[PDB]
Amino acid sequence: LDNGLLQTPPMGWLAWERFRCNINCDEDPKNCISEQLFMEMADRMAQDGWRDMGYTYLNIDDCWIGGRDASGRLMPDPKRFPHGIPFLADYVHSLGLKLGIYADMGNFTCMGYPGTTLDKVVQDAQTFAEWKVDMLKLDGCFSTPEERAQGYPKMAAALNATGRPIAFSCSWPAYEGGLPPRVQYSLLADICNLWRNYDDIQDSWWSVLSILNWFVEHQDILQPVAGPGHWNDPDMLLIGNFGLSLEQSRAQMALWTVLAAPLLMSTDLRTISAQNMDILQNPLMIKINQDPLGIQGRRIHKEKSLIEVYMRPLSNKASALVFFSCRTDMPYRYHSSLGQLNFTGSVIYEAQDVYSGDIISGLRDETNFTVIINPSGVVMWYLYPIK
Amino acid sequence: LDNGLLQTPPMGWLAWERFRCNINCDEDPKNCISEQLFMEMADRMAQDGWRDMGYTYLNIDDCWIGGRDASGRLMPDPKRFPHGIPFLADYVHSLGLKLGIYADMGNFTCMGYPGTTLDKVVQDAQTFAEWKVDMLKLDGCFSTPEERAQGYPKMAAALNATGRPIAFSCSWPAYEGGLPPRVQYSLLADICNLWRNYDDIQDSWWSVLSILNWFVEHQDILQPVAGPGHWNDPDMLLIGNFGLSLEQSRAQMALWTVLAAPLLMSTDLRTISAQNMDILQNPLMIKINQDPLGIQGRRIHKEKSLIEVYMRPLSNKASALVFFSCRTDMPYRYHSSLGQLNFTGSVIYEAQDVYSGDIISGLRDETNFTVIINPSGVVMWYLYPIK
Ligand SMILES: *[C@@H]1O[C@H](CO)[C@@H](O[C@@H]2O[C@H](CO)[C@@H](O[C@@H]3O[C@H](CO[C@H]4O[C@H](CO)[C@@H](O)[C@H](O)[C@@H]4O)[C@@H](O)[C@H](O[C@H]4O[C@H](CO)[C@@H](O)[C@H](O)[C@@H]4O)[C@@H]3O)[C@H](O)[C@H]2NC(C)=O)[C@H](O)[C@H]1NC(C)=O
Ligand SMILES: *[C@@H]1O[C@H](CO)[C@@H](O[C@@H]2O[C@H](CO)[C@@H](O[C@@H]3O[C@H](CO[C@H]4O[C@H](CO)[C@@H](O)[C@H](O)[C@@H]4O)[C@@H](O)[C@H](O[C@H]4O[C@H](CO)[C@@H](O)[C@H](O)[C@@H]4O)[C@@H]3O)[C@H](O)[C@H]2NC(C)=O)[C@H](O)[C@H]1NC(C)=O
Ligand SMILES: *[C@@H]1O[C@H](CO[C@@H]2O[C@@H](C)[C@@H](O)[C@@H](O)[C@@H]2O)[C@@H](O[C@@H]2O[C@H](CO)[C@@H](O)[C@H](O)[C@H]2NC(C)=O)[C@H](O)[C@H]1NC(C)=O
Ligand SMILES: *[C@@H]1O[C@H](CO)[C@@H](O[C@@H]2O[C@H](CO)[C@@H](O)[C@H](O)[C@H]2NC(C)=O)[C@H](O)[C@H]1NC(C)=O
Ligand SMILES: *[C@@H]1O[C@H](CO)[C@@H](O)[C@H](O)[C@H]1NC(C)=O
Ligand SMILES: *[C@@H]1O[C@H](CO)[C@@H](O)[C@H](O)[C@H]1NC(C)=O
Ligand SMILES: *[C@@H]1O[C@H](CO)[C@H](O)[C@H](O)C1(F)F
Ligand SMILES: *[C@@H]1O[C@H](CO)[C@H](O)[C@H](O)C1(F)F
């Protein structure tokens, strides 16, 4: 989408994965979907380094809507958002952050909240711009394929017409099977800043693997369509939550990074461990994700040993390599060479291990190297020519 | 098996899951299958509280064998076990531990090492007794159903004839589908102290879940056959390794405990975190697993919320309850009562949370309670009547 926004993948925090549709503030005031939740996350993002590392978006997801007023305008739940959305945007903006919001192209949101139908698209867009929203995620429940075909372009146009730059996240392809000919990716690139290709991420390693598998199986189609202003979205980071081990958390970060994916957290930033914070705030990892070229990486190698190699091209002749173990036994000594991974010859390379910080020097194409990869884990290299 | 052994489930450490068939001691001296690995693990069990908590078995698995000597007598690999097995048994015994060993009823072990064929059963049993081995795991690769049908009873009798009490771990059912009509559990209880029912555990939550699911699907068959001296074996604990999150780790421990499973670790005790040690060395958890009645627990309730309730009966009218979330979203507030869980009425109960140590007192059948269960996690209660 040519709106000047998201020249690199979006970074921030989204409420949905960790906090879902929890509206019981009387019993659970600390974790319910409320202005307090978002204000507290904003505080954390300002104070705990998140903003300084580039995590700038703070995104409301489903279950925020109170209803529609007399003139049909969307309003937040008065009991859970008493100061209103403009106050929340003001608060978020004052902390150097951006506010995202959520709507659904259809009769209702997935959770049954007032939906944005075709006749409400223009009005809701205007409402969001007036509230000074910076991002919108448009879900696609309770609609027909026809209504989506009309509606998603209609919202992209409506947001445009408001004059306010608003990042546009599109669930449309997820509800169509994510593949051509039903899905038209050239059109999605033109109308959206990012799109959810596939199934909702869940707090499990299985969920991560199934998303990876789908992106890899269809990478010939998916890889070329990503770039500055228009990204594939394999969904939220799980790091900080319940279902991923340490190795798996490091794997998701590394793999989302080489896929030029959004880095959208969804976790309790108030209680996140230092170890998980270290994964998410890794400066080299972020720099790689935010590479100005915006070229989505690919799986370039698979072996019977269940070691996979992913590669992403980066600016200044650099590369990201992710050696990924699908094994479930023990650390694996993976032997390879840059030549066997199709790198340019008569150039001496050097690598920095993204997690350990170690530097491997003197790698020619023919040089045999060994990486030790933990089960359901990764080794990640930032690779560059030295001479 | 009526040899006076394993009146409670065995507790200890087994090499296989974490260290597998790594025989490359030249490149990987610290982690290869060698006498040094076993000696170092024995040292850790003696010094770090494991033995004192009841973890007494230190068990060799596959890939220890060097061949057979001129008398047809089994030999360890001379390069990896230069001192021999009697040396290791003596070392282990001097630390108050017991030594387990591994053989295969068939032409070869699963990894291709010399097998204990029918004509070698007596000789190998005698060898193990002479070495002063305390436990034998008899794997079932490279044999026919009829060879196993003769071989397992033959081994039990052969071990008996040595005059040395040797705990007998039988993989027989795992190679027969683990179910009637092919598996006779009344026969197994007579000839074996424990038996591997089902698939090898791998370092993943999916693996834990598939094992749990199979055990629960078949609990009407499996539950009644377990008792003092004859246990079901759902395989090794993964706690300390790579694939399980903290919640999943606590889950496996609690669920193995309610299933009256062996508590056989397979992890690097030299590098184990304080957190994982705290799970495995939980005194109340161990007490429950080691309950003298040896009654295997059951899943007694399942809900569309994906909360499962497991119950194990214990001595002196006590019980263990495991509230288990198969959910993959967020913490779940599970509302229930002891009456809804079919506990005896007009009795006042008290519960201790096994992980937190909190005491919930004065629970009647009618008393509503709430437990907050994390995704892929548990809450575990030790429950008993009070005056
Ligand atoms: C509604 O939709 C319209 C499009 O239909 C949007 O209009 C586009 O707005 C974007 C962002 O403001 C414009 O992109 C910018 O173009 C600047 C100039 O480019 C001119 O020259 C090139 C020749 O190469 C022409 O192709 C082009 O038509 C322009 O005439 C650039 O200077 C900007 O670059 C910025 O980013 C780069 C990063 O690579 C930095 O290095 C620069 O410093 C700079 O910051 C940028 O690329 C685009 O020109 C507009 N398109 C059209 C067709 O008009 C509206 O923004 C949108 N409205 C809303 C509110 O959503
Ligand atoms: C090789 O195989 C043989 C035969 O299977 C084994 O011999 C058995 O050993 C077990 C375990 O020691 C014996 O079981 C115990 O018997 C005690 C008393 O038994 C007497 O009476 C019976 C007949 O009723 C005779 O067989 C026996 O000779 C004795 O005279 C019990 O007191 C024990 O009770 C235990 O369990 C109860 C639970 O009910 C607990 O409350 C107690 O605390 C206690 O721990 C126990 O049942 C069994 O009797 C032996 N059978 C035979 C036929 O002799 C060998 O042990 C085995 N050897 C090796 C090296 O593996
Ligand atoms: C999305 O909703 C439309 C709009 O109708 C709504 O639901 C009706 C049951 C009623 O409560 C209206 O007031 C709502 O506005 C659905 O379109 C209707 O479809 C039915 C046949 O299924 C038809 O009889 C009605 O005439 C349609 N409504 C009008 C007046 O346009 C539509 O079914 C919903 N989309 C899906 C497929 O989920
Ligand atoms: C176990 O080993 C025996 C003895 O070697 C095997 O019997 C041989 O099988 C091979 C290959 O099938 C034949 O070529 C020979 O004719 C057999 N030799 C003898 C001495 O019988 C037997 O197949 C093996 N059993 C299993 C179940 O793997
Ligand atoms: C690297 O190892 C491969 C395979 O083991 C071998 O063919 C080759 O000779 C080695 N190359 C170098 C430069 O040592
Ligand atoms: C538990 O709570 C429910 C609320 O619906 C109530 O019906 C029930 O009587 C309560 N149990 C008691 C006896 O406290
Ligand atoms: C749409 O459905 C839910 C909200 O109910 C959530 O936003 C999810 O990420 C979705 F799939 F986009
Ligand atoms: C048999 O196979 C392997 C050894 O090769 C291991 O012992 C496993 O636990 C088994 F299933 F028992």
In chain B, domain spans = 1-290, 297-387
Q: How far is CA A247 from the centre of its chain?
A: 19
d(CA B100, CA B94): 15
Cβ neighbour number for residue A354 with a 10 Å cutoff: 25
Pocket lining: B278 vs ligand 6, CB cutoff 6 Å: no
- List residues bridging with A227 in a β-sheet: A230
Instruction: Output phi, psi for B300, to 5 deg.
Output: -105, -15
**Which DSSP category does A384 fall into?**
E
Closest CA to B143 of B173, B175, B121: B175
Closest CA to B212 of B168, B173, B257: B257
Q: What is the CA radius of gyration of chain A?
A: 21
Query: How many residues in total does chain A contain?
Result: 387
Question: Are the CB atoms for B71 and B114 separated by under 8 Å?
Answer: no
Q: What is the CA radius of gyration of chain B?
A: 21
User: Locate tokens 């993943």: which residue?
Assistant: B204
Tell me how many residue pairs between chain A and chain B have CB atoms under 8 A apart: 82
> Coil, helix or strand for A20?
coil
User: Locate tokens 């990894």: which residue?
Assistant: B111
Question: Are the CB atoms for B211 and B197 separated by under 8 Å?
Answer: no
User: Locate tokens 């209803």: which residue?
Assistant: A67
d(CA B314, CA B296): 9
Pocket lining: A123 vs ligand 3, CB cutoff 6 Å: no
Chain B closest CA to A326's CA: distance in Å?
Answer: 10
Q: Is there a cis peptide before residue A181, judged by omega within 30 degrees of 0?
A: yes
Known binding-site residues of A for substrate equal 61-62, 137, 171, 196, 200
- List residues bridging with B321 in a β-sheet: B311, B381
Please list every residue in chain A whose beta carbon sits closer than 8 Å to the beta carbon of residue B28.
333
Question: Are the CB atoms for A8 and A291 separated by under 8 Å?
Answer: yes
**Cβ–Cβ below 8 Å for B243 and A245:** yes
**Helix H segments across chain A?**
16-19, 35-47, 85-94, 121-130, 145-161, 185-191, 205-217, 219-222, 246-258, 274-280, 283-289
Question: Are the CB atoms for B262 and B280 separated by under 8 Å?
Answer: no
- List residues bridging with B249 in a β-sheet: none
Our CA dihedral for A148, A154, A156, A161, rounded to 10 degrees, sits at -170
Fold entry, domain A297-387: Immunoglobulin-like (2.60.40)
Q: Is the dihedral of CA A66, A68, A69, A75 positive or negative?
A: positive
Q: Which of the residues B77, B124, B134, B139 is marked catalytic?
A: B139
Chain B closest CA to A129's CA: distance in Å?
Answer: 31
Closest CA to B234 of B265, B261, B254, B255: B261
**Cβ–Cβ below 8 Å for A202 and B328:** yes
Q: Is the dihedral of CA B207, B211, B213, B214 positive or negative?
A: positive
d(CA A152, CA A140): 9
Residue type, A228: P
Pocket lining: A142 vs ligand 3, CB cutoff 6 Å: yes
**Nearest CB to B205 within list A31, A205, A333:** A205
**Nearest CB to B242 within list A22, A207, A376:** A376
d(CA B360, CA A131): 48
Please list every residue in chain A whose beta carbon sits closer than 8 Å to the beta carbon of residue B205.
204-206, 243
Instruction: Give the determination technique.
Output: X-ray
Q: How far is CA B201 from the centre of its chain?
A: 11
Chain A residue set in contact with B, beta carbons under 8 Å:
17-20, 22, 27-28, 31, 202-207, 241-248, 328-331, 333, 374-377
**Burial class of residue A305 (count of CB atoms within 10 Å of its CB; 0-12, 13-18, 19+):** middle
Closest CA to A171 of A266, A235, A263: A235
> Coil, helix or strand for B174?
helix
Instruction: Output phi, psi for A146, to 5 deg.
Output: -65, -50
**Cβ–Cβ below 8 Å for A376 and B243:** yes
Closest residue to atom 44 of ligand 1, CA basis: A4
Q: Is the dihedral of CA A78, A81, A87, A93 positive or negative?
A: negative
- Residues closing a segment before a gap in chain B (C–N exceeding 2.5 Å): none
In testing the pocket of ligand 1, which one of A3, A132, A191 has its CB within 8 Å of the most ligand atoms? A3
**Cβ–Cβ below 8 Å for A205 and B207:** no
DSSP E strands in B45-113: the ranges are 57-59, 65-68, 74-76, 98-104
d(CA B299, CA B188): 24
Those residues with Cβ within 8 angstroms of residue A213's Cβ, 6 or more apart along the chain or in another chain:
none
d(CA A241, CA A204): 10
d(CA B292, CA B294): 5
Q: Which CATH number fits domain B1-290: 3.20.20.70, 3.30.360.10, 1.10.3720.10, 3.90.550.10?
A: 3.20.20.70
Closest CA to A159 of A175, A141, A138: A138
Active-site residues of A, by number, are 139, 200
Those residues with Cβ within 8 angstroms of residue B17's Cβ, 6 or more apart along the chain or in another chain:
A329, B201, B202, B203, B235, B236, B238, B241, B266, B267
Question: Are the CB atoms for A42 and A51 separated by under 8 Å?
Answer: no
CA angle, B95 then B96 then B100, to 5°: 95
Q: B165 alpha carbon to ligand 2 midpoint, in Å? A: 12
d(CA A47, CA B128): 63
Chain B closest CA to A166's CA: distance in Å?
Answer: 29
Question: Are the CB atoms for A345 and A339 separated by under 8 Å?
Answer: yes
Between β-strands A11-14 and A57-59, what pairing exists: parallel, antiparallel or unpaired? parallel
The two structure tokens encoding residue B130: 């002479």
